[PDB]
C-alpha cells in the first residue's frame, strides 16, 4: 500500500518494510531524518517565542488604554486572545511532540494541537469577514445616518470558529496527525464513515472557507469605484484590512490546497514532507496578524510605546 | 453497526489451493479499500494482500508474491483471496481488514491449516 | 537518615519510608505537591519568555548602533550575551525538567542547568567588579573606552570559567538541589573523591567574597550637563546594579553556606529551591535597569524598534 | 583507591548473636557517615542501620529496631554492628555503605545465615 491507515491515524509511508508504527505509540524517525524533527521543534519554538509577547502586549495595550476602542482594535484584540490560545493550547503540544517525534500525550494531545490551530485560522478568517463588512459600511454607506456592533462581531467569530473546530472533538470528523505526524488537522485522508469526515470536509471548505472569501471579495467589489482624520482613518485602516487578507491568503492557501488535494486523491503516493511544510507554515497565523497592527497602524504603535516606555 | 463475515477456508494439504471470502456489511463498501491479514502460530500478524477501493491495483507481500491473488466485488460487497500452491508456513488464521491497516474488525476469521 | 545521598545526587528527604528515588531515574513528586512542580515550570517559562527579547534586543541595539561604545555598554552587552546563554543553555533544561519532575536528560542535563546558571551569576559579578573599577578610575582619577572595557570583558569570561568549568572537569560537581529541578555546586555531600569541600571555600572567598571586597573598596573611595550627569547617573546605576545583585544572590549564597556547614541536617526540598529559582532572575533584572535607569540607551532602543 | 573490608559474620543458630565489622581504607573516614545494608535471598536490598560522621545519633530500620545496634570507631576507621536476638529472615549478605545511600562500594560482604 502507499500510506498506512490505523484506528486513530494515517501514516503517509508504506508498511511493506514493516517499519511503520502508530504516531501515538512510538516515534516517527523513519518518515524523515531525526534532525528534520528538531528543525520543526526549533522553528516551532520561535513561533511560541515571538508569539506570546506580541499577542500579550497587544492585548495589554488595548485593554490598558481607555482609548483605542474602534472596531478594528476590538477584532485585533480578539485575534490576540485567540493567538494566545494558539500559543498555549496548540503550539506547546506540537513543540513537545516535535521533540519526541510522536504524540506521546496521546489522541487527546492531537485534539489540542488541531483544535486551537483550527480556531486561530477560523477566528482570524471570520474576523476578516467582519472587517470586510465594517470597511464596506463606512465607505459605501448603505445605511444612512449610521456609523457595540464590533463586540457582537467578535461574538460572531467565536460562534462560527467553534462551528468548525468543536465538531471534530464531538464526533463529526476528527483530528488526525498529518505529514510528519507532528501537527494535526481535519481528516482529509481516511473516509471513516463512522466519523463522517468526508461530509465535514465539504462543510469546512465551503462554509468555513469559501463562503467567507465570497463575502470578502463581495465587499471588496463594492470598493472598486472608490479605490485629515476621515481621509486617513478611512484609507489606512481599509488598506490594512486588505494587507491582513493578503497575508492570510499567503498563509492558509498552501495548507488549504494540499488538504483538498489529499481529500480528492485519498490513498495516492505522497510523502510526509508534502503536508508538513504548508501545515507548519500556516502556524505563523499566531504572529503575522498583530505584526501588521504594529507595522502599518502607527496610531497603535505610538500607544504601544506608552505602555513599554512609561 | 459494522460486520465483516469471514467465509471460506479449512484443512488443505501442502501445495494445495483455497479461495477465501470476506462479506462486508453496514458501511459504504466501494468507498474504501480492503486488505487480507493472517495470524501465524506464535508469530505476529502478517499483512498478506491489499487492493484499492475501485479494485484496479492489487498489492501483495513478498512472502506470498504471485501465489496468492486478491479480487473484490463492489456490487455484492465481497473480497476474495485465491490462495494457490500453498506451503506449510501459510498455516494461519486469516482476517480481512478495512482501510490500509492491520487492525481487524470482528474476529475468528478462518482456520487455514496447511 | 535525614537526607538521601547517592552516586550522582542528594535528595533532602529521608528514605526510611523507602519512597526515595534517584532524580535522574524517576520523578520527585513525593518531595512536594505535583502542582508545585508546575509552579516552577510556569515561573521558569516567564524567565525564558521575558529573558530572550530583552537580552536579544539589548544585544541587537548595542551592536547595530556604531555609537554606544562606552565601557558601560560593553559590559551590559557582555551580560546580555551571557544572559542568552542562561536562557538557552540552562533555563531550557530546568523548564523541561520542572515539567517532568526529574532530570530526564540525565547527569549531563544537570551539568547544563548548573553550568550556564553559574556563569550568568559569576559573569554578572565579575562584571560588577569591572564597573566598580571603571567608576572609580573616572571619579577619583588616578590616571591623568573601547580598549580597556574589551579586556575587562575578557576578564569576566576568564574568571567565570574558573568557577563554572572545574565542576565539569572533576574538581567539584553539579548536583540537583531542593526539589531536584535546578542544579548547583555540591554543598550537601563532601564527595571527597571529587573534593567539592575544597572548591566551596574556593568559590565563596575567591569567586565571591574577593569581588565584594574590591567593589566595597572602590565604593569606599567614593565617600568624600554631560560630565555632571554621565558621571552621576552611570555610577548611580552601577550601585543599583549591585544592590539588585545583593538582593538576588544572597538568598542562594547564604542557604548554600548554611547547607555546607550543616551537612546532613534536617532540611526539606523547599528550603533551597525557593532562593535557587529566585536567583534565576539574574537573566532579566540586569538589562531591565539598563533600559529603566539609563535613558540614553532607551532613546536608541526605540530607534531600533520604531524605525 | 578506596577499600572497605567486611569482617565478621558466618553461620549462627536462631535467636543467636553476631557482631559485624567494616574496616575503612583510603579516604577521610570521620568526614563521612556510614551505613549497613543487607541482601536477603530473592528480595531487594534493605537499609539496615546508619549513623552520623561524628557518631552521635544512630538510626535503625523498623525491621531490626532495638535488636541491632550500630557503632563506629573514627580513630581506627571501623564500623561495627552488634546484631542480637536474630531471626530467620535476617539471613542475608551484609554490606557497609558510604554517605547515606544503599549504593555499595565493592566489598567481601559477609554471609550471615540464620
Ligand atoms: C506495520 O507493519 C508491522 C510489521 O509488518 C506491524 O507490526 C506487527 O503488528 C502486529 C500487531 O498489529 C504484531 O502482532 C502481535 O504479536 C503479538 C506477539 O508478538 C510478539 O512476539 C513474537 C514472538 O513470537 C515476536 O516475533 C513479535 O515481534 C512480537 O514481539 C501477539 O500476541 C498479537 O496477537 C495476539 O493477541 C491479539 C490481541 O488479543 C489477538 O487478537 C491475536 O489473535 C493474538 O492472540 C492469539 O490468537 C490465536 C488465534 O486465536 C490464539 O491461538 C493464541 O493463543 C493467541 N496468542 C496467545 C499465544 O495468547 C499480535 O499478533 C506483530 O508482532 C508486529 N510485528 C513486528 C513489527 O514485530 C504493524 O502493526 C504495522 N503497523 C500498523 C498497525 O499500521
Ligand atoms: C530508597 O530506599 C529504597 C528501599 O526499597 C531503595 O529501593 C531498593 O533499591 C535496591 C538497590 O539495590 C533494590 O535492590 C535490588 O533489587 C533487585 C530486584 O528488584 C526488583 O525485584 C524484586 C523482587 O524480589 C522486587 O521486590 C523489587 O521491587 C524490584 O522489582 C535485585 O535484583 C538486586 O540484586 C542484584 O543487584 C545487587 C546490587 O547491589 C547485587 O548485590 C545482587 O547480588 C543482585 O545481582 C538488588 O537487590 C531494591 O529492590 C529496592 N527496593 C524496592 C522498593 O524495590 C532505593 O534504592 C532507595 N533510594 C535510592 C534511589 O537511593
Ligand atoms: C499509489 O500512488 C500511485 C501514484 O499516485 C497510484 O498510481 C495510480 O494507479 C492507478 C491504477 O493503476 C492509475 O490509474 C490508471 O491511469 C492510467 C494512466 O493515467 C489510465 O489510462 C487508466 O485508465 C487508470 O486510470 C493512475 O494513473 C496511477 N497514477 C499515476 C499516474 O502514477 C497507485 O494506484 C497508488 N496505490 C494504490 C494502492 O492505489
Ligand atoms: C537530622 O537533623 C536533626 C536536626 O538538625 C539532628 O538532630 C540533632 O542531633 C544532634 C546530635 O547528632 C544534637 O546535638 C542536636 O541537638 C539535634 N538537633 C535538634 C535540637 O533537633 C539529627 O541528628 C539529624 N539526623 C541525622 C542522623 O542526620
Ligand atoms: C499545524 C496545525 C494545523 C494547521 C491544524 C488545523 C488547520 C485547519 C483545520 C485549517 C483549515 C482552514 C483554515 C484554518 C483556513 C481556511 C481554509 C481551511 C478551512 C482549509
Ligand atoms: C538555578 C541554578 C543555579 C542556582 C545554579 C548554580 C549557581 C551557583 C553555583 C551560584 C553561586 C554563586 C553565584 C553564581 C553568585 C555569587 C555567589 C555564589 C558564588 C554562591
Question: What's the reported resolution, in angstroms, to a tenth?
Answer: 3.7
Q: Provide the Cα torsion C83, C86, C89, C95; round to 10°.
A: -130
Coil, strand or helix at A118 = helix
Where in the sequence is the domain holding C137, given as residue range(s)?
Answer: 1-307
C120 CA closest ligand 6 atom index: 14
Q: Chain centroid to CA D3: how far?
A: 15
Q: How many CA atoms lie less than 13 Å away from C81 in the CB half-sphere?
A: 14
A268 CA closest ligand 3 atom index: 2
**Is the pair B, C in contact (3+ CB pairs within 8 Å)?**
no
Identify whether the C-beta of residue C61 lies closer than 8 Å to the C-beta of residue C301. Answer: yes
- Residue D53: phi and psi, rounded to 5, are -60, -45
Q: Strand A4-5 vs strand A10-11: parallel, antiparallel, or unpaired?
A: antiparallel
Question: DSSP string of D37-101?
Answer: EEE-SSS--EEEEEE-SSS--EEE-STTTTTEEEEEETTTTEEEEEEES--STT-EEEEEEETTS
Tell me which residue in A52, A53, A305 faces C302 most closely, judged by beta carbons. Answer: A305
Q: Chain centroid to CA A21: how far?
A: 29
Residue with cell 565579575: C126
Cα separation of the two ends of chain A: 63
- The residue among A78, A77, A81 whose CA lies nearest residue A52 is A81
Number of domains into which chain C is organized? 1
CB-based contact (8 Å) between D99 and chain C? yes
Instruction: Kindly determine whether residue C5 and residue D100, on different chains, have CB atoms separated by under 8 Å.
Output: yes
- Chain A residue with CA closest to C48: the answer is A49
Residue with cell 571586597: C213
- Residue C186: phi and psi, rounded to 5, are -75, 95
- Chain A residues touching B61 at Cβ < 8 A: 16
What lies within 8 Å, CB to CB, of D24 at 6+ separation is D4, D5, D34, D77, D78, D79
What lies within 8 Å, CB to CB, of D105 at 6+ separation is D2, D4, D97, D98
Q: At what angle do helices A235-264 and A107-139 cross, to 10 degrees?
A: 140
Instruction: Kindly determine whether residue A7 and residue B59, on different chains, have CB atoms separated by under 8 Å.
Output: no
Instruction: Kindly determine whether residue D101 and residue C5, on different chains, have CB atoms separated by under 8 Å.
Output: yes
A33 is in an annotated binding site: no
- Using what technique was this structure determined? X-ray
Listed by number, the residues of chain C in 246-305 with a beta carbon closer than 8 Å to a beta carbon of chain A are: 298, 302, 305
Say which DSSP state A188 is in. Answer: S
**Reading across the β-sheet that carries B34-39, which strands appear in turn?**
B58-60, B46-51, B34-39, B92-98, B111-112
Instruction: Kindly determine whether residue A194 and residue B2, on different chains, have CB atoms separated by under 8 Å.
Output: yes
Instruction: Kindly determine whether residue A6 and residue B103, on different chains, have CB atoms separated by under 8 Å.
Output: yes
Q: Which of C91, C98, C103, C118 to mutate to test the pocket of ligand 6 (most atoms within 8 A of CB)?
A: C118
CB-based contact (8 Å) between C49 and chain A? yes
CB-based contact (8 Å) between B47 and chain A? yes
Q: Is D59 in the pocket of ligand 4 (CB under 6 A)?
A: yes
- Helix H or strand E segment including B30: none
Those chains having 3 or more beta-carbon pairs within 8 angstroms of chain C are: A, D
- Minimum CA distance residue for ligand 6 atom 11: C118
Q: Provide the Cα torsion A85, A88, A93, A99; round to 10°.
A: 140
Q: Rounded distance, CA A100 to CA A112, Å?
A: 17
- Chain B residue with CA closest to A198: the answer is B31
Q: Provide the Cα torsion A220, A224, A226, A229; round to 10°.
A: 30
Coil, strand or helix at D12 = coil
Q: Rounded distance, CA C247 to CA A64, Å?
A: 31
**Is the pair D, B in contact (3+ CB pairs within 8 Å)?**
no
- Helix H or strand E segment including A60: helix A34-64
Q: How many CA atoms lie less than 13 Å away from A285 in the CB half-sphere?
A: 35
Domains and CATH numbers, chain B: 3-112 (2.60.40.10)
Q: Is D42 in the pocket of ligand 2 (CB under 6 A)?
A: yes
**Reading across the β-sheet that carries D58-60, which strands appear in turn?**
D58-60, D46-51, D34-39, D92-98, D111-112
Amino acid at each position: 500500500m502507499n500510506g498506512t491507515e490505523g484506528p486513530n491515524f494515517y501514516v503517509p509511508f508504506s508498511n511493506k518494510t514493516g517499519v511503520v508504527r502508530s504516531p501515538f505509540e512510538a516515534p516517527q524517525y523513519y518518515l524523515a531524518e531525526p534532525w528534520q524533527f528538531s528543525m520543526l521543534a526549533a522553528y516551532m519554538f520561535l513561533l511560541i517565542m515571538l508569539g506570546f509577547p506580541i499577542n500579550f502586549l497587544t492585548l495589554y495595550v488595548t485593554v490598558q488604554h481607555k482609548k483605542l476602542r474602534t472596531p478594528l482594535n476590538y477584532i485585533l484584540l480578539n485575534l490576540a486572545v485567540a493567538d494566545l490560545f494558539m500559543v498555549f493550547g496548540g503550539f506547546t503540544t506540537t513543540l513537545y511532540t516535535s521533540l519526541h517525534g510522536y504524540f506521546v500525550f496521546g489522541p487527546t494531545g492531537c485534539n489540542l494541537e488541531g483544535f486551537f490551530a483550527t480556531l486561530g485560522g477560523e477566528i482570524a478568517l471570520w474576523s476578516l469577514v467582519v472587517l470586510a463588512i465594517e470597511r464596506y459600511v463606512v465607505v459605501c454607506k448603505p445605511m444612512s445616518n449610521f456609523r457595540n456592533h464590533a463586540i457582537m462581531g467578535v461574538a460572531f467569530t467565536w460562534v462560527m470558529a467553534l462551528a468548525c473546530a468543536a465538531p471534530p472533538l464531538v464526533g463529526w470528523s476528527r483530528y488526525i496527525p498529518e505529514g510528519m505526524q507532528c501537527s494535526c488537522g481535519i481528516d482529509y485522508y481516511t473516509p471513516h464513515e463512522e466519523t463522517n469526515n468526508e461530509s465535514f470536509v465539504i462543510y469546512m471548505f465551503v462554509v468555513h472557507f469559501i463562503i467567507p472569501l465570497i463575502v470578502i471579495f463581495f465587499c471588496y467589489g463594492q470598493l472598486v469605484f472608490t479605490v485629515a482624520t476621515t481621509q486617513k482613518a478611512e484609507k489606512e485602516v481599509t488598506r490594512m484590512v486588505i494587507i491582513m487578507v493578503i497575508a492570510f491568503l499567503i498563509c492558509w492557501l498552501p495548507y488549504a490546497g494540499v488538504a483538498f488535494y489529499i481529500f480528492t486523491h485519498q490513498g495516492s503516493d505522497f510523502g510526509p514532507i508534502f503536508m508538513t511544510i504548508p501545515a507548519f507554515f500556516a502556524k505563523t497565523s499566531a504572529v503575522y496578524n498583530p505584526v501588521i497592527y504594529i507595522m502599518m497602524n502607527k496610531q497603535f504603535r505610538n500607544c504601544m510605546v506608552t505602555t513599554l516606555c512609561c | 453497526q459494522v460486520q465483516l463475515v469471514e467465509s471460506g477456508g479449512g484443512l488443505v494439504q501442502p501445495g494445495g489451493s483455497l479461495r477465501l471470502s470476506c462479506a462486508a456489511s453496514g458501511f459504504t463498501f466501494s468507498k474504501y479499500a480492503m486488505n487480507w491479514v493472517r495470524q501465524p502460530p506464535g508469530k505476529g500478524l502478517e499483512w498478506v494482500s491489499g487492493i484499492r477501493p475501485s479494485g484496479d491495483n492489487p498489492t501483495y507481500a513478498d512472502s506470498v508474491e504471485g501465489r496468492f491473488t486478491i479480487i473484490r466485488d463492489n456490487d455484492k460487497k465481497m473480497v476474495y483471496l485465491q490462495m494457490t500452491s500453498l506451503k506449510t508456513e501459510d498455516t494461519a488464521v486469516y482476517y480481512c481488514t478495512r482501510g490500509y491497516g492491520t487492525m481487524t474488525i470482528e474476529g475468528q476469521g478462518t482456520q487455514v491449516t496447511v
